[PDB]
Amino acid sequence: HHWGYGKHNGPEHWHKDFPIAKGERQSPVDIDTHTAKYDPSLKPLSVSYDQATSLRILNNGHAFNVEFDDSQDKAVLKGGPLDGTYRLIQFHFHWGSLDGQGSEHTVDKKKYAAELHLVHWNTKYGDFGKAVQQPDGLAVLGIFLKVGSAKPGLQKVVDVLDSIKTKGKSADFTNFDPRGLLPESLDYWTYPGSLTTPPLLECVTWIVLKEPISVSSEQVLKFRKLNFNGEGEPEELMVDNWRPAQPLKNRQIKASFK
Numbered sequence: 145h146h147w148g149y150g151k152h153n154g155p156e157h158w159h160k161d162f163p164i165a166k167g168e169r170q171s172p173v174d175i176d177t178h179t180a181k182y183d184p185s186l187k188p189l190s191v192s193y194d195q196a197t198s199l200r201i202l203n204n205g206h207a208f209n210v211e212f213d214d215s216q217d218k219a220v221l222k223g224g225p226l227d228g229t230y231r232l233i234q235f236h237f238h239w240g241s242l243d244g245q246g247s248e249h250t251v252d253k254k255k256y257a258a259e260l261h262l263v264h265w266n267t268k269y270g271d272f273g274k275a276v277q278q279p280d281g282l283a284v285l286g287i288f289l290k291v292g293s294a295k296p297g298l299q300k301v302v303d304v305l306d307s308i309k310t311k312g313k314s315a316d317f318t319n320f321d322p323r324g325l326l327p328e329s330l331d332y333w334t335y336p337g338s339l340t341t342p343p344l345l346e347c348v349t350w351i352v353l354k355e356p357i358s359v360s361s362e363q364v365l366k367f368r369k370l371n372f373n374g375e376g377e378p379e380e381l382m383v384d385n386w387r388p389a390q391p392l393k394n395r396q397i398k399a400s401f402k
């Protein structure tokens with residue numbers, strides 16, 4: 145499969161290999177803040193990352209990815225709309241060529257510079273590959289990035305990117321604390337959706353924080369120096385690796401806050 149983000153292989157083409165692209169619960173979506181309703185039934189959100197064990201950072205040709213040890217319940221997400229325990233496996237970002245675009249979710253049609261996704265899987269399914277085959281298999285926590293002041297808890301990530309410039313490169317990435325990437329507030333929107341790249345599986349409970357984090361222009365500029373290509377191939381800058389908003393169809397987006 146040779147999907148990507150270019151003109152010839154980008155999101156508008158994906159449905160030919162992955163017909164679920166035109167399904168009933170595709171992601172991302174636009175979050176209309178005036179239609180989302182506060183839901184007093186949502187339990188408090190519990191982000192438990194004290195014992196998180198980061199391993200490695202990988203450029204996979206689509207994004208860069210920070211992987212965690214998920215062989216035990218070390219870093220988990222619980223509460224909110226979720227039943228049971230979801231284990232952190234990895235995080236990654238989507239970003240733009242310019243500061244005015246890059247996020248996948250939008251808020252009243254506003255695009256942010258980037259979007260962070262912390263990916264967790266439902267431990268009742270035993271492994272990640274089983275979980276993605278279930279409608280409640282994954283919980284993705286999404287965090288918008290706006291350009292402003294630097295985010296000190298991002299700089300360890302930015303500083304390692306020149307060591308994984310091209311597809312297939314990886315580096316050791318131990319002792320990284322993903323709590324440094326969270327905003328002050330865990331107020332969120334939630335809805336049922338999908339992965340935002342092939343295979344586009346409809347397996348995700350989306351939890352999107354309302355409060356963006358601020359990163360500096362210099363930090364996001366370094367994201368944009370990565371490459372979609374492998375070493376020794378013509379350079380194609382890793383920018384605009386985001387899927388645009390998909391039809392909401394017969395879904396409601398719920399707010400955790402009044």
Ligand SMILES: Clc1ccc(OCc2nn[n-]n2)cc1Cl
Nearest residue numbers: 234236261263284338339340341
């Ligand atoms: Cl492990 C993993 C890595 C990246 C990825 O990128 C697409 C995406 N982002 N949010 N949902 N889908 C999806 C997964 Cl599951």
Ligand SMILES: [Zn+2]
Nearest residue numbers: 236238261340
């Ligand atoms: Zn993502």
